[PDB]
Amino acid sequence: SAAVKEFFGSSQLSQFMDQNNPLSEITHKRRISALGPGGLTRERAGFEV
Amino acid sequence: QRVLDATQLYLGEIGYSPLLTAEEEVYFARRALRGDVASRRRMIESNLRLVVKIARRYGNRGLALLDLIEEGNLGLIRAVEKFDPERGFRFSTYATWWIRQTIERAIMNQTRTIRLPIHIVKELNVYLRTARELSHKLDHEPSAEEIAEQLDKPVDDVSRMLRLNERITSVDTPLGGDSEKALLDILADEKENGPEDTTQDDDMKQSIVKWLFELNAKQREVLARRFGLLGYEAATLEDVGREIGLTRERVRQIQVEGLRRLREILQTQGLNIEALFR
Amino acid sequence: ARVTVQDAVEKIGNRFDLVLVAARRARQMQVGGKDPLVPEENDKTTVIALREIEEGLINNQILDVRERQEQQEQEAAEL
Amino acid sequence: EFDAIKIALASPDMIRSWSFGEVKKPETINYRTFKPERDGLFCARIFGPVKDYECLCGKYKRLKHRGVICEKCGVEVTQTKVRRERMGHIELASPTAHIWFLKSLPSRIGLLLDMPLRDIERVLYFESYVVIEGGMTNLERQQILTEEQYLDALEEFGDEFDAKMGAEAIQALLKSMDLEQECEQLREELNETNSETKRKKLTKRIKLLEAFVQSGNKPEWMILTVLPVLPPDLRPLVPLDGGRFATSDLNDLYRRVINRNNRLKRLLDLAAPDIIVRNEKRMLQEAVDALLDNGRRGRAITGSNKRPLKSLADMIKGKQGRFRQNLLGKRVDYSGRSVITVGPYLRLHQCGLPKKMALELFKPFIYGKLELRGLATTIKAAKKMVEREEAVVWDILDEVIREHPVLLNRAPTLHRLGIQAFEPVLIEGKAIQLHPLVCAAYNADFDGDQMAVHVPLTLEAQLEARALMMSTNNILSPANGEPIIVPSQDVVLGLYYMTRDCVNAKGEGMVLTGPKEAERLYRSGLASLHARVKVRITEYEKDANGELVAKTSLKDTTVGRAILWMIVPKGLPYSIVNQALGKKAISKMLNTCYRILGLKPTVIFADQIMYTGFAYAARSGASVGIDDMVIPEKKHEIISEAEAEVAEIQEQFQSGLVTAGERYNKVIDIWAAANDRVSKAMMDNLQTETVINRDGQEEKQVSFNSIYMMADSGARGSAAQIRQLAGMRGLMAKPDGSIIETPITANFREGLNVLQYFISTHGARKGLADTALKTANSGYLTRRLVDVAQDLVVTEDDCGTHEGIMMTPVIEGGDVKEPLRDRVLGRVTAEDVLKPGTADILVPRNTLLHEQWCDLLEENSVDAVKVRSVVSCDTDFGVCAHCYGRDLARGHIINKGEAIGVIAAQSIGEPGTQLTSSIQVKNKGSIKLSNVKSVVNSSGKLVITSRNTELKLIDEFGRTKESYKVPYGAVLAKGDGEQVAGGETVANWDPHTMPVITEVSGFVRFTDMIDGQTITRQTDELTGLSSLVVLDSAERTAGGKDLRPALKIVDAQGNDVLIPGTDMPAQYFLPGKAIVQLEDGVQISSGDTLARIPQTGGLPRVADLFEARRPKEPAILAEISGIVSFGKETKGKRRLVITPVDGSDPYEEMIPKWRQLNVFEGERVERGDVISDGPEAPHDILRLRGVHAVTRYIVNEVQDVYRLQGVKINDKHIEVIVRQMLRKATIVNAGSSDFLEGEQVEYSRVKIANRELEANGKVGATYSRDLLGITKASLATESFISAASFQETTRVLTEAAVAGKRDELRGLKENVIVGRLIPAGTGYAYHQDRMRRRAA
Amino acid sequence: RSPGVFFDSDKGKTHSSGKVLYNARIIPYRGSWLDFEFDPKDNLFVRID
DNA sequence: GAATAGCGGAACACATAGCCGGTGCTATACTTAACGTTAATTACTGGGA
DNA sequence: TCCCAGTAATTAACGAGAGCACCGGCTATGTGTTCCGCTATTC
Ligand SMILES: [Mg+2]
Ligand SMILES: [Zn+2]
Ligand SMILES: [Zn+2]
């Protein structure tokens, strides 16, 4: 329970739904982010990705 | 040339003593308990691997590994201090009690930043064991009411002991995920007044002194020594009775008179009870 | 009644001796030991000080002379 | 109060003197009561009471009972803020080393002991015994022993030898160390040695030991024995709401250290076996060594959240430490922020403040006024008056706001125009109204950009913001003399629309009796705003000494240009508004008004310009519709032709005539041709599209098209965003940077398809990521530039020198890039600049060159002005006001005090977000080959025997408009000193054939030119000539390595042709890979080819020029003037023997043999000329050609980055960064002074120390100037705080603390930190008063 | 990034001669990494994590 | 005004009991722990001239 | 025998928004006294 709640509660990718449109909900759900666990960070993301 | 971390050096070191046989242990304790320090050194120096084996199980609590090992070492020194070979028992059975209990007391002591005592931590562990056994019966988190049901103890007691399991947070951890805002940016210095309340008090003090000198002398000396205000000490009506005006009833009378004059003086400046007390 | 301090800077150079002189003069007028020479137009003491600089009847020499004269007058009050 | 901050090592008895009790227990507080626990990390007998004037028992509770230590608790009643300033100390049971004096990489315990760090940490972790004064009975002093080695040595020596283990051993080393005798021994060994590595090593060890003697410290205080704890209110245990608590992470590490110290104490007291106490000391020492820093010694210990705890050194380092988060920039009361809007009715010193922010900020002033009016006799009533916002608290606010400037400021504050002052004007709103002319300065858009406001409270600050930071005072940029309040985007389009003419509007040809009848005509609708009308104007010149003289006239002009003329003040000539008056033509009116009239009728002029430009773009109705993008009709034809050509080339490539790389640049050629032809064929359709008729047929003219008037007038447009609205938008790139073949050929009016829109999206995601990373680099650049230029402050009025650099206009091969006039506008001379009639001084020696002396140079056409510069100023600690120059954002000379260092750092910092075969004379002048030897060739012309060959095109007036550089060996079609035409290919050469041409004539011989060893047989197989070509030394045998083919020349009469002028023989030893076509015994001429020899970033270029990094291929130079040769050639190293004519010959230099050399092994090279080619480091420029060469190299190589992007920056701002890079100058010979040989003392101090010695009878010091980069010259500073408030802090505090260093508080970051006035502006006279009254 | 072999080059300077040094890299979903980088002397060097 | 009496009652202190809180002790035997940069610079260390 | 090149470490990368005996010592706790204050009665 601690592991799965630690993911769903506060991971990098467990974000609030920006719920101030229908459009904002859809484009929050259809997001392709490259950060998080197993992904790079902003500081060392070169001009290629 | 060993790689110089503390754990590898220690765990490589402790193997330099052959483990002792039962008659060997008994003979070493016979020499040890009459005051031969070399026998104590041999007995404690050999069974260090027992301490690493026992304190291996107590890992991943609040203490790091080498802390657990070194606290087990203290109990091992206590164990050779009070071992009896005359019971004929193997030494490991008697020392296991001392090492296991002196690592258990270590985790009960040196874990929480606000040190809870022993009995409070044993009482909290009773409730956590009960909750772990109760969670498989109702497949949700057992409440404070549920643990108080299963142990038939008062609900306020179990609520208090679970609230003493707070897991005191850090300050320096950032908030919101983004590393720009820790609790130092959120917390406000609550005891220190800012300049507003600090200048209201000084202006109120000077205003009080001004209004008191606006009042006549016999009233304001009673009202000064009465509250310790105008450089005086807060005195009793009986005390200023014997000190200034012998009739205590007249001291009460002049106090009520001065309070009425000051009520008029305050309300002339528009400060009523609604003004000073909202 | 003041937008540009330029003529004051024409009187007192360096753009910084202006600020120190006008600060000393507005301390004279704010902590009310003094009164303005040129009339105030309901300006704050800062701007009356700058208009006094602009007429050229206040500078560091006038201030030091008047403070030394004030201390002489205060020493004449011993009796 | 205090003059200096002194830092030093803290003894184990100083620490017992700060402290107020020994923290003996780990436990922090109680748990039922929240009482601090006796006696752990929060106590009250130790650190003080928790409540003001109240004990822990509470039996003493008053200010009346102040000071008395209690009996039930031992708690001294005081204030409760004494818990921020009371320390406790832990007594460590064994000593443990301090991690800063052990692991900061030039390790002080290491290089103090001269013991390598691995051997020290093998002692501290109890692995190896180390001898401590065992004597040389068998062993060395600092020799370590492993355990069995120790055991057999102990068997051989039970006595007379002692080897301890651990921090007790290291402490016995340090306290057993002698300083004076060891320093004497190392000084003698430094005297005897000659290897420069060991010389530098002994210099460093000698300097560390000498600083240890001179400071009052001892070496053994590096080993902590008594550890001090922080006061409790600097690491609090604040209760959160709900019975919850939160700790600073120091309480955990302190609890860990106290726990292991208690357990070690009990382990010694139980007489444990030695393995357990050695493990326990290893475990402490580390709990400590973590507390002091986490992550240094191995991996950090972490908390519950799998994060490392914040240690002591973490609260100082980096952006989260005190130094750049809590101490340099602070959060500030009397402040607020909002969104901003326009409000263009303002005068330019005003700003809109809402009635809710202005009621909040000006709160204590309203209390102080409501007490004054009698409206509230107290503050408890005056608070509740402004709380409910009565009718009378809004009249008080209009008084207390009336002449009180506020301080508007945008968020990315770059330069000093990002914080300005405005007398506020109250708005019923929630936003900050803000004048339109100042958004150019703030770089503010009204797209939601937010600005913060600030209140100058004190009486000095209300004058500081009015005299220095008011908006009407800042009209010129500090970076250059350009104005900064220029009309931006709407006013200029309105002013363009007004100042025009059409060929037939209403009222054309009527005569007008003034610029006011022009208003009456237009407002009554009787003439258009563009009608060519004879008006009478009355313009005032001030030809005499301020005499405005009237002169009425009759000017043929417009009704718009006559309406506008009433806005123009008196002194300006009428011909400044008698044009189309676009954007450029306005800023050269609002600058001539500033120069002619002054400041005040320019600040009143810019408001009237804005008020007119808005009002006449209102009535302009200037829209933009979709018919305003006139797509050209020949676009289809051009695209059809260029689509035929690409298919033809595509057929030809399939026919094998061209490769892919040849059709690539042939298809990109036709598309870059048609992309131009489209954009040129639409510009004749845009601008001339008005074809109107006056009393007759038709007359073309400049168009009234709406998208032309928004790009022609410069108001928000160009000719490159157009051509993407009507013309084709050309070729596009790809993520490799390669250019896509098939370009995108649709404008934005015709729309793009799917593929053309996808192609032109890498170009946008490459540009957006560019501005994402660009700001992150440009912030760090100006962060470094400010801290390298802190303490530079205009401190004198004249340093009194006659040195200073020489200025020349920037002639970079073709035209003049920047002329002499714009380089030496506003900078005083160092010599008397005199006319080329050189018997008369044209200007005096120390005149300040404003415009009226610029034009006297512009008429007499002077080319070289020697100028006084910052980097040659002879001021100790500052820059003289003459040597700096003009104020540059004020027209006068620089005021004494004004801190040029920061304002010259920001002017380079803020533009950083805008960054990333034959010679033909093209003008009419005379050929001047400068300072170069060149012989007559066999064709009679001039061939080049010089390496630095420079072609000048000297005009008829003796100046240069076109300069050039010629390579070695080029035939000159012309001669020197004679006028040639344009288009003349004056010199010619092959870029591949390197001639090794002679200077003498006669029968050449192939002396020392033999085959099988030196040369080989590769004749002309194509023609039939016996070519005697040479192999290389890497392939030929070892019997002919140094035997080179020389060309000795004799005659047929038995005599030898030598070098004329001298007695030296004429031979030319050809190196390897030499292709000789001639023969021996055949006649050669002068200038005949003997052997035919074959051969950035925008922002990081600036960031590596100011850092002065070594480029990877340095141009190796001539370290001493003299003849050149080759010594014994190694395997890859050619030891270049440089023999002077008189000086020391044996300077040889190992050159990488694979690098292309340039000198022909026998030439007498001038000192500091190239040996190979490549970009040169400024270190070599400095050491060879001096300071005045590197100060021209850097300001040329960075102006060629800024002017490439069209950014103008005056050069003094780069000269002061150059001046701050070379503050350090190591010694060569110490002389009679008190310096060492190889040490790097700062040049300012050695400029005084030998100055008094030459003022004395003694001798000076010989010193070479040294250059450091801005990350090192800012980190090698005297004041240890302005270097620690920066990058690495644990290095600088440690290096200073072992040296007993002492900040003097003379810069600006230090006085900012300590909280007193900076020594720059208003706070300069007070620091002068302080430094005068002190030492008096 | 997809687990499996990944034959990146270097393609930078990284040598002071400009030679390219190809390196395989074997990323799993879970496990230790593995490279095979070349050396400038044409030596093939494994490295694990 | 003023003495005296009653009287609430607040509280303060003192003496106690009682109960938090720290400590010691337990006896088949038991024996070596827990997966990226980017660049620059500098100190170090094995290797070459 | 000193230079020199690969290797590893260190620094930097914007702004603002278990379980029982046992004892002792603290502390809550009755409780007395007491002291103050308040009121009420009477000369
Ligand atoms: Mg914007
Ligand atoms: Zn007390
Ligand atoms: Zn000077």
Swiss-Prot record, chain C:
It holds the Pfam family RNA_pol_Rpb6. Signal peptide: none annotated. Transmembrane segments: none annotated. Keywords: DNA-directed RNA polymerase, Nucleotidyltransferase, Transcription, Transferase. The keyword rRNA-binding does not apply. GO terms for cellular component: DNA-directed RNA polymerase complex. Belongs to the RNA polymerase subunit omega family. This is DNA-directed RNA polymerase subunit omega. The lineage of its organism: Bacteria, Pseudomonadati, Pseudomonadota, Gammaproteobacteria, Enterobacterales.
Curated annotation (Swiss-Prot), chain D:
Changing residue 768 to R: Resistant to antibiotics salinamide A and B. Changing residue 682 to V: Resistant to antibiotics salinamide A and B. Changing residue 675 to D: Resistant to antibiotics salinamide A and B. The keyword Acetylation applies. Binds 1 Mg(2+) ion per subunit. Its EC number is 2.7.7.6. It catalyses: RNA(n) + a ribonucleoside 5'-triphosphate = RNA(n+1) + diphosphate. Acetylated on several lysine residues in the presence of glucose. Transmembrane segments: none annotated. Zn(2+) 2 binds at residues 799, 873, 880, 883. Keywords: Acetylation, Antibiotic resistance, DNA-directed RNA polymerase, Magnesium, Metal-binding, Nucleotidyltransferase, Transcription, Transferase, Zinc. Gene3D superfamilies: 1.10.132.30, 1.10.150.390, 1.10.1790.20, 1.10.40.90, 2.40.40.20, 2.40.50.100, RNA polymerase II, clamp domain, RNA polymerase Rpb1, domain 3. Co-administration of salinamide and rifampicin or salinamide and myxopyronin suppresses the emergence of resistance to both antibiotics. SUPFAM superfamilies: beta and beta-prime subunits of DNA dependent RNA-polymerase. SMART domains: RPOLA_N. One of its GO terms (biological process) is intracellular iron ion homeostasis. Changing residue 733 to E: Resistant to antibiotics salinamide A and B. Mg(2+) binds at residues 445, 447, 449. The keyword Membrane does not apply. Belongs to the RNA polymerase beta' chain family. DNA-dependent RNA polymerase (RNAP) catalyzes the transcription of DNA into RNA using the four ribonucleoside triphosphates as substrates. PANTHER family: DNA-DIRECTED RNA POLYMERASE (PTHR19376), DNA-DIRECTED RNA POLYMERASE SUBUNIT BETA (PTHR19376:SF54). NCBIfam families: rpoC_TIGR. The RNAP catalytic core consists of 2 alpha, 1 beta, 1 beta' and 1 omega subunit. When a sigma factor is associated with the core the holoenzyme is formed, which can initiate transcription. The rRNA transcription and antitermination complex (rrnTAC) consists of RNAP, NusA, NusB, NusE (rpsJ), NusG, SubB, ribosomal protein S4, DNA and precursor rRNA; S4 is more flexible than other subunits. This is DNA-directed RNA polymerase subunit beta'. It comes from Escherichia coli (strain K12).
UniProtKB/Swiss-Prot annotation, chain E:
It comes from the Bacteria. Signal peptide: none annotated. The RNAP catalytic core consists of 2 alpha, 1 beta, 1 beta' and 1 omega subunit. When a sigma factor is associated with the core the holoenzyme is formed, which can initiate transcription. DNA-dependent RNA polymerase catalyzes the transcription of DNA into RNA using the four ribonucleoside triphosphates as substrates. Belongs to the RNA polymerase beta chain family. This is DNA-directed RNA polymerase subunit beta. It comes from Escherichia coli O157:H7. The chain holds residues 151 to 199 of 1342 of the full protein.
